[PDB]
Every structure is written in C-alpha cells, then in structure tokens.
C-alpha cells in the first residue's frame, strides 16, 4: 500500500487523494481519485 502510494504520488505529481481501509494473507483497500485523465 505504501509503495503504491509513493509510486502514484511520483507519477501524478500530487493530484490525488489516496485512502486505505483494512479488509477485515492480510489485504487492504484503496481509493485514488485520479483527478483528470491521460494517466488513468
């Protein structure tokens, strides 16, 4: 989750609202809000 947050923050320079909510191997959810287009 943290490395996906960092890679999407380095790809979209800012431009995102990244959340995570633990699903209750352990896993996790994520919401991105890719504000715009052409990187979707």
Partner 1 sequence: LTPNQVNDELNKMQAFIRKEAEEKAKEIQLKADQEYEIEKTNIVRNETNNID
Partner 2 sequence: MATALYTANDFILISLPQNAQPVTAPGSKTDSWFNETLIGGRAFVSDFKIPEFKIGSLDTLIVESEELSKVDNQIGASIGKIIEILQGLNETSTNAYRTLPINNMPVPEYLENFQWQTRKFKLDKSIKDLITLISNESSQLDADVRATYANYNSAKTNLAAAERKKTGDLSVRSLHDIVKPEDFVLNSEHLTTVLVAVPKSLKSDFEKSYETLSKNVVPASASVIAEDAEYVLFNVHLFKKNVQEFTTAAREKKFIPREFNYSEELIDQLKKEHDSAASLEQSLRVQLVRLAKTAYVDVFINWFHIKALRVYVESVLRYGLPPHFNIKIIAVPPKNLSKCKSELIDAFGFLGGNAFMKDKKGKINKQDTSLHQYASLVDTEYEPFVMYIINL
**Contacts with partner 2, residue ranges (CB under 8 A):** 3, 6-7, 9-10, 13-15, 17, 36-39
Q: How far is the CB of 34 from partner 2 (least distance, A)?
A: 11
- The structure tokens 């352990």 sit at 26
Cα separation of 5 and 30, whole Å? Answer: 9
| Residue 25 binds which entry of partner 1, partner 2, none, CB below 5-8 Å type-dependent | none
Of 6 and 35, the one with the shorter C-beta distance to partner 1 is 35
Element containing residue 2 per DSSP (H, E) = helix 2-11
């Amino acid at each position: 989750v943290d490395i996906l947050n960092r890679i999407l923050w380095r790809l979209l320079r800012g431009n995102l609202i990244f959340q995570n909510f633990p699903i209750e191997v352990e896993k996790d959810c994520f919401i991105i809000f890719t504000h715009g287009e052409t990187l979707l």
